[PDB]
Design an enzyme around this catalytic site. Structure first.
Site, PDB file in Angstrom:
ATOM      1  N   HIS A  85      31.772  43.132  44.208  1.00  0.00           N
ATOM      2  CA  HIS A  85      31.902  44.572  44.449  1.00  0.00           C
ATOM      3  C   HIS A  85      31.618  44.864  45.920  1.00  0.00           C
ATOM      4  O   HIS A  85      31.084  45.914  46.253  1.00  0.00           O
ATOM      5  CB  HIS A  85      30.905  45.386  43.626  1.00  0.00           C
ATOM      6  CG  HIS A  85      31.181  45.444  42.156  1.00  0.00           C
ATOM      7  ND1 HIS A  85      30.504  46.314  41.323  1.00  0.00           N
ATOM      8  CD2 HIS A  85      32.005  44.716  41.364  1.00  0.00           C
ATOM      9  CE1 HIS A  85      30.908  46.129  40.080  1.00  0.00           C
ATOM     10  NE2 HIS A  85      31.815  45.166  40.078  1.00  0.00           N
TER      11      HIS A  85
ATOM     12  N   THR B 187      44.113  50.059  46.048  1.00  0.00           N
ATOM     13  CA  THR B 187      44.317  51.196  46.953  1.00  0.00           C
ATOM     14  C   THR B 187      45.686  51.168  47.615  1.00  0.00           C
ATOM     15  O   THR B 187      46.302  52.208  47.804  1.00  0.00           O
ATOM     16  CB  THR B 187      43.206  51.317  48.014  1.00  0.00           C
ATOM     17  OG1 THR B 187      43.117  50.128  48.817  1.00  0.00           O
ATOM     18  CG2 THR B 187      41.845  51.595  47.349  1.00  0.00           C
TER      19      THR B 187
HETATM   20  C1  LIG Z   1      36.133  39.296  39.239  1.00  0.00           C
HETATM   21  C2  LIG Z   1      36.139  40.787  39.465  1.00  0.00           C
HETATM   22  C3  LIG Z   1      35.795  41.629  38.430  1.00  0.00           C
HETATM   23  C4  LIG Z   1      35.825  43.042  38.638  1.00  0.00           C
HETATM   24  N1  LIG Z   1      35.548  43.842  37.532  1.00  0.00           N
HETATM   25  C5  LIG Z   1      35.632  45.200  37.730  1.00  0.00           C
HETATM   26  C6  LIG Z   1      35.447  46.075  36.620  1.00  0.00           C
HETATM   27  O1  LIG Z   1      35.197  45.676  35.472  1.00  0.00           O
HETATM   28  N2  LIG Z   1      35.533  47.432  36.851  1.00  0.00           N
HETATM   29  C7  LIG Z   1      35.812  47.940  38.145  1.00  0.00           C
HETATM   30  O2  LIG Z   1      35.849  49.175  38.245  1.00  0.00           O
HETATM   31  N3  LIG Z   1      36.007  47.130  39.190  1.00  0.00           N
HETATM   32  C8  LIG Z   1      35.950  45.797  39.031  1.00  0.00           C
HETATM   33  N4  LIG Z   1      36.176  44.974  40.061  1.00  0.00           N
HETATM   34  C9  LIG Z   1      36.435  45.489  41.408  1.00  0.00           C
HETATM   35  C10 LIG Z   1      37.799  46.083  41.671  1.00  0.00           C
HETATM   36  O3  LIG Z   1      38.786  45.289  41.021  1.00  0.00           O
HETATM   37  C11 LIG Z   1      37.983  46.017  43.195  1.00  0.00           C
HETATM   38  O4  LIG Z   1      36.920  46.668  43.833  1.00  0.00           O
HETATM   39  C12 LIG Z   1      39.279  46.718  43.631  1.00  0.00           C
HETATM   40  O5  LIG Z   1      40.449  46.104  43.060  1.00  0.00           O
HETATM   41  C13 LIG Z   1      39.294  46.646  45.149  1.00  0.00           C
HETATM   42  O6  LIG Z   1      40.538  47.414  45.597  1.00  0.00           O
HETATM   43  P1  LIG Z   1      41.042  47.202  47.051  1.00  0.00           P
HETATM   44  O7  LIG Z   1      42.281  48.058  47.172  1.00  0.00           O
HETATM   45  O8  LIG Z   1      39.964  47.440  48.017  1.00  0.00           O
HETATM   46  O9  LIG Z   1      41.372  45.653  47.174  1.00  0.00           O
HETATM   47  P2  LIG Z   1      42.220  44.683  46.177  1.00  0.00           P
HETATM   48  O10 LIG Z   1      42.531  45.276  44.901  1.00  0.00           O
HETATM   49  O11 LIG Z   1      41.474  43.398  46.204  1.00  0.00           O
HETATM   50  O12 LIG Z   1      43.555  44.454  46.941  1.00  0.00           O
HETATM   51  C14 LIG Z   1      43.705  43.866  48.259  1.00  0.00           C
HETATM   52  C15 LIG Z   1      45.054  43.182  48.222  1.00  0.00           C
HETATM   53  O13 LIG Z   1      45.299  42.644  49.559  1.00  0.00           O
HETATM   54  C16 LIG Z   1      45.970  41.330  49.378  1.00  0.00           C
HETATM   55  N5  LIG Z   1      45.758  40.688  50.666  1.00  0.00           N
HETATM   56  C17 LIG Z   1      44.656  39.975  51.065  1.00  0.00           C
HETATM   57  N6  LIG Z   1      44.783  39.575  52.339  1.00  0.00           N
HETATM   58  C18 LIG Z   1      46.000  40.054  52.745  1.00  0.00           C
HETATM   59  C19 LIG Z   1      46.698  40.005  54.034  1.00  0.00           C
HETATM   60  N7  LIG Z   1      46.216  39.455  55.147  1.00  0.00           N
HETATM   61  N8  LIG Z   1      47.919  40.605  54.050  1.00  0.00           N
HETATM   62  C20 LIG Z   1      48.462  41.215  52.953  1.00  0.00           C
HETATM   63  N9  LIG Z   1      47.851  41.320  51.733  1.00  0.00           N
HETATM   64  C21 LIG Z   1      46.645  40.725  51.719  1.00  0.00           C
HETATM   65  C22 LIG Z   1      45.282  40.765  48.194  1.00  0.00           C
HETATM   66  O14 LIG Z   1      46.002  39.712  47.662  1.00  0.00           O
HETATM   67  C23 LIG Z   1      45.218  41.966  47.271  1.00  0.00           C
HETATM   68  O15 LIG Z   1      46.317  42.138  46.379  1.00  0.00           O
HETATM   69  C24 LIG Z   1      36.142  43.557  39.925  1.00  0.00           C
HETATM   70  C25 LIG Z   1      36.502  42.688  40.985  1.00  0.00           C
HETATM   71  C26 LIG Z   1      36.488  41.310  40.773  1.00  0.00           C
HETATM   72  C27 LIG Z   1      36.863  40.398  41.922  1.00  0.00           C
END
Ligand SMILES: Cc1cc2nc3c(=O)[nH]c(=O)nc-3n(C[C@H](O)[C@H](O)[C@H](O)COP(=O)(O)OP(=O)(O)OC[C@H]3O[C@@H](n4cnc5c(N)ncnc54)[C@H](O)[C@@H]3O)c2cc1C
Ligand SMILES: *[C@@H]1O[C@H](CO)[C@@H](O[C@@H]2O[C@H](CO)[C@@H](O[C@@H]3O[C@H](CO)[C@@H](O)[C@H](O[C@H]4O[C@H](CO)[C@@H](O)[C@H](O)[C@@H]4O[C@H]4O[C@H](CO)[C@@H](O)[C@H](O)[C@@H]4O)[C@@H]3O)[C@H](O)[C@H]2NC(C)=O)[C@H](O)[C@H]1NC(C)=O
Ligand SMILES: *[C@@H]1O[C@H](CO)[C@@H](O)[C@H](O)[C@H]1NC(C)=O
Ligand SMILES: *[C@@H]1O[C@H](CO)[C@@H](O)[C@H](O)[C@H]1NC(C)=O
Ligand SMILES: *[C@@H]1O[C@H](CO)[C@@H](O)[C@H](O)[C@H]1NC(C)=O
Ligand SMILES: [Cl-]
Length: 581
Positions: free
Chosen positions: A514, A28
């Site tokens: 998830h 995101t």
């Molecule tokens: C093992 C695994 C398998 C998955 N398989 C699938 C799949 O097959 N299909 C699917 O649709 N979804 C899948 N997902 C889920 C999907 O990847 C996540 O739901 C999605 O990436 C979450 O997006 P986000 O923006 O909320 O967080 P994220 O993509 O996790 O990004 C958050 C970011 O914040 C960074 N961060 C953390 N703490 C801090 C801080 N204090 N300051 C600055 N940066 C920080 C992290 O390093 C990271 O880069 C999977 C997830 C995992 C863990």
């Protein structure tokens, strides 16, 4: 190239001002950073704890190397509390690097049921958050490729109308070059014998039955992680800056009137050596559902009962960190005959009755009679603060199950030499929490408790779904390829009944990774933390834009929705930018 453009030294950002600071360069965060910087006059700084990993090699670029990266610096491996279900902690795999969890995930690209997204508007009072609107944003994000003859012969079905073809995230069939295993079509045949649909396009709004699906990769099979898709094509924009290797610790708040305003953030890696950077417009939290709520708590935004004992003044009292919803996953694996050789994945999105079979009557009785009790019990465990409000969520899930017959469990099939199912109940009734345990953000001392299996229907549902995976692995056409179970194998009698499965499951499951809901998008009265434009209640210029905000789980893999969510919130952010000139 991109690496030379990334900032690593805090001295290069300390004290500066940009229009928007994004904490977390994950799915995101990077989607939003790219969308906002399309206007050259808007400056964005992304602060990411990890670094650039997209071109490291197969461990990241090859989806078939899934899991090899676990335990490395690219895996946060957040540890849970000692879980009550089994007196053990568990690790939450979560990507650390530009792209976040999209660097390490399974690449599965599917969408939920229309009724689930529609309920975000009709039940959770989020105007404009319905299937039609969210799906449009999802297709806008999407750049899908239709399957070729070989892929269709394996079992693929792609309805062009359900996919964007001119978007940003490259998606298409995973194809290692090997022949596709006939086991995918065998699973389809086995469920067809039970009257279950097959080949429905899981991007259309009705995820039910057994189908193959696109994956987030380019035609050449290179992983379409969010950094490759949203940052690599745009890093030369002078108004888009990225600081790597640093953690955002807290949001800086200023108050001169009736509501505090987010003016910047503090970042660093250890207490006593931190720096600040400022936002002229807004601070956007995108650090992931396990972290964004903690950033709020470290900032004085959360429950006084949590903050006060830690020596943190409560600036805004909200139920931050509650309503955590993650799924439980278990495995059934079997040896296969040589004729079953080949590549291929598929999944059965199974309804409540498909999951429970003969136990359907008993499971429906629990669903009809125990909602209030379950809500009281989850609230007493600290997974939510208001029983009346939690009951609304439970009644919504019951409506989905009884009146819309949405998929309740997912049985995900991998082949490539075996017939292996990872299985999860999609709709847990348990509610957990995440709370900081110290005032120092850089100590990373927190209690993350998904409360897996602490709701009885979740344990029964998981047991039933996993037993179903064993059953279907030796049903109909699947028997053609079955060559003996290897997991549970010796660890659970092959004729185990449901009760035996419920005793086995707590000691043989993993988190599904998830997790959603820790900064729920729903009215404050219902226990929400953010409004329908992802704004933290009672704070100016602060939004949570990541997986923390969905108020419910969904019968799908979440990327399709999270990319859509980021684009939708970006439009709201841009509308406010346009009006506040
Ligand atoms: C093992 C695994 C398998 C998955 N398989 C699938 C799949 O097959 N299909 C699917 O649709 N979804 C899948 N997902 C889920 C999907 O990847 C996540 O739901 C999605 O990436 C979450 O997006 P986000 O923006 O909320 O967080 P994220 O993509 O996790 O990004 C958050 C970011 O914040 C960074 N961060 C953390 N703490 C801090 C801080 N204090 N300051 C600055 N940066 C920080 C992290 O390093 C990271 O880069 C999977 C997830 C995992 C863990
Ligand atoms: C996670 O860990 C926690 C512990 O940290 C677990 O919670 C504890 O669970 C245990 C049970 O495993 C429980 O201890 C029992 O308390 C009962 C009373 O509340 C007792 O009846 C019982 O004692 C009997 O069984 C023991 C075990 O064999 C014997 O050593 C003991 O002597 C008792 O047996 C006797 O019974 C009769 C009485 O009629 C007596 O005349 C005879 O001596 C006979 O032998 C246990 O001590 C704890 O109360 C729980 N809580 C705590 C804080 O410890 C939790 O279950 C774990 N969770 C998981 C998933 O593993
Ligand atoms: C494909 O989409 C078209 C247009 O929306 C629709 O008429 C048709 O029913 C869809 N078919 C399937 C199998 O999804
Ligand atoms: C599920 O099973 C219950 C109990 O037998 C039955 O009442 C209900 O109609 C079934 N629902 C569906 C969608 O088949
Ligand atoms: C509890 O939740 C209900 C239902 O959303 C709401 O009407 C009520 O105001 C809430 N009460 C408190 C004290 O939060
Ligand atoms: Cl491509």
């Amino acid at each position: 190239g991109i690496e030379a453009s990334l900032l690593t030294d805090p001295k290069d950002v300390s004290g500066r001002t940009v229009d928007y600071i994004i904490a977390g360069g994950g799915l995101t965060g990077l989607t939003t950073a790219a969308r906002l910087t399309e206007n050259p006059n808007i400056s964005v700084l992304v602060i990411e704890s990890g670094s650039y990993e997209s071109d490291r090699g197969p461990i990241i670029e090859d989806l078939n190397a899934y899991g090899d990266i676990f335990g490395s610096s690219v895996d946060h491996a957040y540890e849970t509390v000692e879980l009550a279900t089994n007196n053990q902690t568990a690790l939450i795999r979560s990507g650390n690097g530009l792209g976040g969890s999209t660097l390490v995930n399974g690449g599965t690209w599917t969408r939920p049921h229309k009724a689930q997204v529609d309920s975000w508007e009709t039940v959770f009072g989020n105007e404009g958050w319905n299937w039609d609107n969210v799906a449009a944003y999802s297709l806008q994000a999407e750049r899908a490729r239709a399957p070729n003859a070989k892929q269709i012969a394996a079992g693929h079905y792609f309805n062009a109308s359900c996919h964007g073809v001119n978007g940003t995230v490259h998606a298409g069939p995973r194809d290692t070059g090997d022949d596709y295993s006939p086991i995918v079509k065998a699973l389809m045949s086995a469920v067809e014998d039970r009257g279950v649909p097959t080949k429905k396009d899981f991007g259309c709004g009705d995820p039910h039955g057994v189908s193959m699906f696109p994956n987030t990769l380019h035609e050449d099979q290179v992983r379409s992680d969010a950094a490759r898709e949203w940052l690599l094509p745009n890093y030369q924009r002078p108004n888009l800056q990225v600081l790597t290797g640093q953690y955002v610790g807290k949001v800086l708040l200023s108050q001169n009137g009736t509501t505090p305003r987010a003016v910047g953030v503090e970042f660093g890696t250890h207490k006593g050596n931190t720096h600040n950077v400022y936002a002229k417009h807004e601070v956007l939290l995108a650090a992931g559902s396990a972290v964004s709520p903690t950033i709020l708590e470290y900032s004085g935004i959360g429950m006084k009962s949590i903050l006060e004992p830690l020596g943190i003044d409560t600036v805004v009292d909200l139920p931050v960190g509650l309503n955590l919803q993650d799924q439980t996953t278990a495995t059934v694996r079997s040896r296969i005959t040589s004729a079953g050789a080949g590549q291929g994945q598929a999944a059965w999105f199974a309804t409540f009755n498909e999951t429970f079979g003969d136990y359907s009557e008993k499971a429906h009785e629990l669903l009809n009679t125990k909602l209030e009790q379950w809500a009281e019990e989850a609230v007493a465990r600290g997974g939510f603060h208001n029983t009346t409000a939690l009951l609304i969520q439970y009644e919504n899930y019951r409506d989905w199950i009884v009146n819309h017959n949405v998929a309740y469990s997912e049985l995900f099939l991998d082949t490539a030499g075996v017939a292996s199912f990872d299985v999860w109940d999609l709709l847990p009734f348990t509610r957990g929490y995440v709370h900081i345990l110290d005032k120092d953000p850089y100590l990373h001392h927190f209690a993350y408790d998904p409360q897996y299996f602490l709701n009885e229907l979740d344990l029964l549902g998981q047991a039933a779904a996993t037993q179903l995976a064993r059953n279907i692995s030796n049903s109909g056409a699947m028997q053609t390829y079955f060559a003996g179970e290897t997991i549970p194998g010796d660890n659970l009698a092959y004729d185990a009944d449901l009760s035996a499965w419920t005793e086995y499951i707590p000691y043989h499951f993993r988190p599904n990774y998830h997790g959603v809901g820790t900064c729920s998008m729903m009215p404050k009265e219902m226990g929400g933390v953010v409004d329908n434009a992802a704004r933290v209640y009672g704070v100016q210029g602060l939004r949570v834009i990541d997986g923390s905000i969905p108020p419910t789980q969904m019968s799908s893999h979440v990327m399709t929705v999270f990319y859509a969510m980021a684009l939708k919130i970006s439009d709201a952010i841009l509308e406010d930018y346009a009006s506040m000139q």
